[PDB]
Symmetry: D2
Subunit: 492 residues, 4 copies
């Protein structure tokens, strides 16, 4: 008998043990959490608006011919502003994939600009990390621009940018324009206007949302905390909750506000998690603000929301699509528990089960490769011929990569986890493709973390191994505590 | 048919793919690599000498009654100089185990001093990491001292140290004395004198060492680079190579120097990996030094050794017990490949296979626990009674911990890898309990990294899962590259 | 005799020597340099707009009762977001003046929050330095807010903020709203709109400006580099040059653009001094932009947008060395840290006009303080370590404090921009660090020939300023403790020519 | 009249006001404070020992040919480990003097390695600042080494070091050997041994020292705090106090220990100013130590080892405020950054003795420079921006450079410790930052009563030092560009008493 587990696509994955029974408040981001934007339509809209802003501000008319290609960008790429590269890197700064425009650079050539295939993430001035779902269009746009200027006759390619006559245009200054333009599209409400004038096209709607939030509110408190203003929030949330019946079968509809003990807009995250801004109440009928302490607030800070709800830190499960630094953990008061929404997980899981044959083959090749070396040790002069096998391993591995997209898996390249995966393991207690998967779990559930196995763990059997062990290895090899010395796996 | 693998205790574990065929130079640290100090005798010697230095310098006579307890210290603990705690932490700064003297502090009480069970490793002034094999005696000694002053009537326990009358003695200032004393024992040659006057007692000897080094020298170059001076190095290495026959059966003995293309002493690592010090030649018969370019050198730097050997960075496999920062990777020239000797691996592997029953039980408890929640989802009001099961999971888990020692595994506590494990995954291409395990591998071997699986990977089957998937999860879902975009898994 | 100097109010002051003959390009910021905003009318406008913004988003109506008070703020104060104090500090982080709202904290009381009367400037998270002229209304508003929440009984004062019932309202979060509101006023354009609709009220103009700029362009190139957009710049500049004559009276007026070789708008300083943004050239006839340089005839326009200081150098055919950059802002070590040559600097500090008036018109206060100081020395004369005398100086100290406070108030409630008592302010040390030349206005360059060698004055230490260049005869031998009893064969040869040249600027 | 001042060579100079009456505890460093080492004999000893050490571990025999040259090094030079230059820099990182070996790099050439003639001091990895008196022989040795490897044909000069055949030998790694060797000489005790075996040759002594210390102890407590061990301290101190009389001639000699309330050895400064090491009390009769304080009669000894400055404060029953710490070392913001009160400071700077002699005995050089400066001003008099004149100042500049170099060489090859031309050195700015009081020796305190109020002198900026306190009458109205045209109902009330007190030190 093997362990029971819910169906794969309904699962909530566990990084750190979490006893859901102790959770008293449920907190939601809105954007890409409750309001899931349809893909690739939303990225494309963001792409078009940014390109148009750039053109309206001096960039060549050629850009208007770019079309967003959803198959190219993977989230979490690092843009190197010195050399104009998109880089997929691991948790430690090692290069996995390097693309200059649409040209993927192989290993040997990479060492020219990166002699140890290494970058220092610390160099925030040089390296910009494109972690967010909103960063997707600009990730593609950056590649489009570098490709454009590289192959445009009017320009002269250099190491750190382009010559336009006697004039130099660095990748760095070009990056600033793109960054400024993306900011512009968002904060000018250009994007927001187009989204609300066509909700069906851009925003996913699902009857399960009101059901899950309903059930949460029966067991504890529910709050929203979004950077968006009330007006846009009201438009979006009305849409999400717009069904002829409430969530209980045969029940009548009710306002989205009804599902919340506390609604917070203009959150200004991430400053919100520090001292944020003064909390003010919102009169929804007039739109008049008033500092101090209806259930609609603007601004404030995470500590203030925690006070308003009568919650302590670890009583709160905060659900959202965004990875924040160690900011919460640094404070002297208890930080929140976290649930990270990662929509790509939906596609990634499909590859995991539907491309089963590719994994199979990779495993056979590995098994056969080990056979070739089976009889060899340090006294062996033999050099088995493996070039055919490797060649096939590379071909199958690349096919697998392409299953995810041109930039491969969000979580890995080959045997290496990405910086993004590493950040997920660091910040998220739980994760899933959507928060709606909580539907499939009781509120008393004990979320238990599975071990992440090191090589000597994953590849050594618990079977007792039947010559003496070298003393070079064994080194010639207080009242002890009578009760368990740690408690992180039970969450108590 | 499953994959062939060498016997567990002969294995070399792989973090990053490494084609041994391309390795042209083999580099060794001496201390705890070629010269493996017998345990716990060596730690005990270091312990006694440090305690005696402290007493000779004003600390109470009581200390002379301390005896080194090999079952207490695990390597890689963080000493918190503010509160006088030994901390086992994970890769991200989360507390796993907290010991004040010999008192292990449970969770609730920990939040008093660590409200989020979190420390900031960055705080190098506050937190000191005891990563080295030499740090073992002092790890125990620190616990001994805090325990001593806490339970000694002559003193008054405070949060950040002790009152001795109207006088305050902080943990921080006490830590400085211990650190100074350990330094003193090493650099005063006190420890070295006792070691060489009794090699059999303190230093492991193994005929396989000359064999492996012999074979390495047949295929490439071999060098030694040690911080020790030539005199101590000569004493130790003569001992290690002292057998009636050479390594080949029936062969005559030969000098240890014969096994090296290049011998470097007074290396002053880690400055050695930067610009180090001016390289000087050593006349072994006279002991006279001479800057500039026999095969014995003193000082110098890693770039200079690489030049002397005609090697490029990635041609070099550097074998040793020490984890260095990103120093090598930061340079503009190719860094070395790495093999990390981790002697504790010898004991850890024994636990893995000999305590099979404990793992079994833990797994059954997990399987049964999942049965209890099997029929429950968010509509369930049920709260299954699990306290008996958890209680048993804690008991079995603690028994497992104690198998490693009072401070548990070097690599983990529960479902969480330690900071030390994390550093191993970051720095070491390969690791083993000893470098001698290379004996069991041909020089043409392709070391291949195994994936470290995330939760959604390790707990989801490649079996195609047979209601529509929520659009909240799926989001209502350039010439592509025709060849593999990465190469780190083949090392080419 | 005595050294000839120009009239005090026409002087350019010299921190580091500058041979004007080598300057080939003159660069100008616009705001508070060419366009000098009327005071206190312009500060008061910024204040009211910022106040109104805060009220419009929830701050109490009582804020509307506050009137801008130009006598209160001095530039360069540090706002401590932890304790809600405005601090006047010296170059080394020592506290000189501490105001909590409009309450000045003196001596011993300061030690409760600042145990060594010291802050660590590096803590940019905690301390915000209000260095700019635009920061003036902000400086006053912070004080108004701390003061109001303190006096208003609706709010309960704590060390790090106020409680409004169950809600804590930290000084840090209140500061954030003030910063947001100041930005909003500036970047939504309310301030610019009010400005251009009454330029006579808000903007100074002087016929000497076209004159000086025309002379500059006879010996070199002249450029404008401003963060403002072209529309605003054009409105401002047209006004500055709007006289019924050109550079000289009786000459034809000409358009302001005719005075420049290059006009750079939307500069995005300080990013501008790094890699900035892609340079575009602007067609003002059309309003369209194009990145790079126009290929056709439009290339003969001179209006550009974005770019970087390196790019501007290239366009002008200049090396940094031969550019004098004239403006009101102090930048960091950004320029000199580069591999590229940095610009010479002239810092405009308009408060100098008022400060020099105090220095010169309040001479009797300076004279009394000197007399009192001389009298104190007299009281201790002929006393040494064997002496038991404790002369009573309490009356003299009381007068010193009284006259010194009177002097302070001549500058304003926060004292001089440049000092408090014997101590220079942080702002003053930043001036000495960043500016080669400084004056109340760049217009003082009118009074110097372009061949002028500006020579830096020595800044004297205590042992230099209080000891004469006169042979001091000693009766007894000097202590070997002081002298150190001071009076192989290889010795280096001494240098035969001067080893430094920073004072001649003569490369 | 004119202000009374003590004789220049007896003066204590004041950076920040200090009411001596409030000082209740006097603390002393030993090295270069109480034990002033003979110059240049002691520098030369350190030099030779360090040279010998380097030779003994592989450096060429030719190093033995170098003789210490006291006329070369000035304290506070920055060694650039990248390019192998000794740099004299100002407070802001600007280059004043650059020496590569014994070759001085001038003007334009400096720009090749320093494009803006600027270094970033923060780059502690690259730049090592040689601030201490012990660093003097080291400063000279670095120059000797760069010079020797440059001239010796066995080695080929590169930008960042030398090639010895196939071996590269970077300036950074060579610097590391020099640092290691200096430490070794100090910490193996070779230097201490040579010192104590000839104290008359290496250590100054003055009967005024016991005198001054005895007076201090009549008004307050006196303590010693030294990094040295008791054995060395005892040998040094016994020598310093070895006269056939006590404090006053004709009085009985007494042991040096009798002059102190507390003797702290093995202080491990600067860690000492943090948490240091556990305090132990030393029994000098026995030589044994015990952490904490002796419980029995031994508690009446006064020799301690290790500890921290906070602990020492506690032992003395003093608050930081009332301790004056006298020594030759400049510490960082360590003390004032603490929640605990920091110590007042008297900085001993023995070079001041020679510097003051130049200031006073070379008056004719100062007079010529003033004349030349006045003549330059005359040549530009009555010229303004309309003027085409380019007066020829080349002859005057040449003389200025010549006289200025002559002045420099009066101090040494690297010029004054405190300045180069019109610019203060980094060292000078650190003095102003760290020291309340300074002098060539603490012995000058002999010439002041313990009731003395030390009053800081203003450090004048250019617009203060070159403008008189005299009413300046203006014919034409001042430009609104300079004045800003400067001349709700709620206004704050002005402060009625002085808002700062750092100049009276009167809490």
């Amino acid at each position: 008998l093997k362990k029971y587990r819910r169906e794969a696509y309904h699962r909530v994955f566990v990084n750190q043990s979490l006893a859901m029974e102790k959770i008293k408040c449920f907190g939601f981001n809105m954007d890409y959490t409750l309001a899931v934007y349809k893909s690739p339509e939303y990225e494309s809209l963001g792409f078009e608006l940014t390109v148009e802003r750039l053109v309206s501000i001096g960039y060549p008319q050629e850009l208007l011919s770019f079309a967003y290609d959803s198959t190219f960008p993977t989230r979490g790429l690092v843009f190197d502003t010195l050399y104009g590269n998109l880089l997929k890197v691991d948790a430690y700064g090692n290069l996995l994939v390097c693309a200059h425009g649409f040209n993927f650079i192989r290993g040997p050539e990479t060492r020219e600009q990166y002699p140890n295939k290494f970058i220092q993430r610390d160099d925030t001035e040089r390296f910009y990390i494109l972690n967010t779902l909103f960063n997707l269009p600009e990730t593609y746009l950056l590649a489009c621009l570098v490709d454009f200027f590289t192959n445009c006759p009017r320009y002269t390619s250099c190491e750190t940018g382009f010559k336009d006559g006697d004039l130099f245009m660095s990748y760095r200054s070009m990056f600033q324009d793109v960054r400024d333009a993306v900011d512009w599209v968002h904060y000018k409400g250009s994007l927001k206007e187009k989204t609300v004038e066509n909700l069906e096209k851009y925003v996913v709607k699902d009857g399960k949302l009101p059901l899950l939030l309903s059930r949460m509110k029966e067991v504890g408190k529910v709050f929203l905390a979004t950077n968006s203003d009330y007006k846009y929030t009201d438009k979006i949330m009305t849409y999400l909750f717009d069904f002829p019946h409430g969530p209980k079968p045969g029940s009548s509809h009710r306002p989205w506000q009804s599902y919340f003990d506390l609604i917070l807009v203009d959150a200004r995250k991430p400053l919100f998690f520090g001292e944020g801004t003064v909390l003010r109440q919102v009169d929804t009928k007039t739109g008049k603000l008033k500092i101090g302490t209806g259930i609609v607030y603007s601004g404030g800070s995470s500590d203030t929301i925690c006070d308003l709800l009568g919650a302590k830190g670890k009583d709160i499960l905060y659900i959202g699509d965004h990875i924040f630094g160690d900011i919460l953990k640094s404070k002297k008061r208890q930080g929140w528990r976290t649930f990270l929404v990662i929509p790509e997980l939906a596609q990634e899981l499909h590859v995991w089960t539907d491309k089963s044959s590719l994994f199979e083959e990779l495993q056979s090749l590995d098994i056969f490769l080990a056979e070739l070396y089976k009889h060899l040790d340090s006294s062996s002069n033999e050099r088995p011929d493996i070039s055919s096998i490797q060649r096939r391993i590379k071909k199958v591995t690349h096919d697998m990569d392409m299953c995810y997209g041109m930039m491969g898996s969000l979580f890995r390249s080959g045997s290496r986890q990405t910086l993004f995966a590493s950040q997920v393991m660091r910040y998220a207690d739980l994760y899933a493709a959507s928060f709606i998967n909580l539907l499939y779990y009781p509120f008393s559930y004990l979320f238990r973390a599975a071990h992440v196995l090191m090589p000597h763990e994953s590849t050594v059997e618990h079977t007792h191994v039947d010559e003496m062990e070298s003393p070079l290895a064994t080194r010639n090899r207080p009242l002890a505590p009578q009760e368990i010395t740690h408690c992180h796996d039970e969450d108590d």
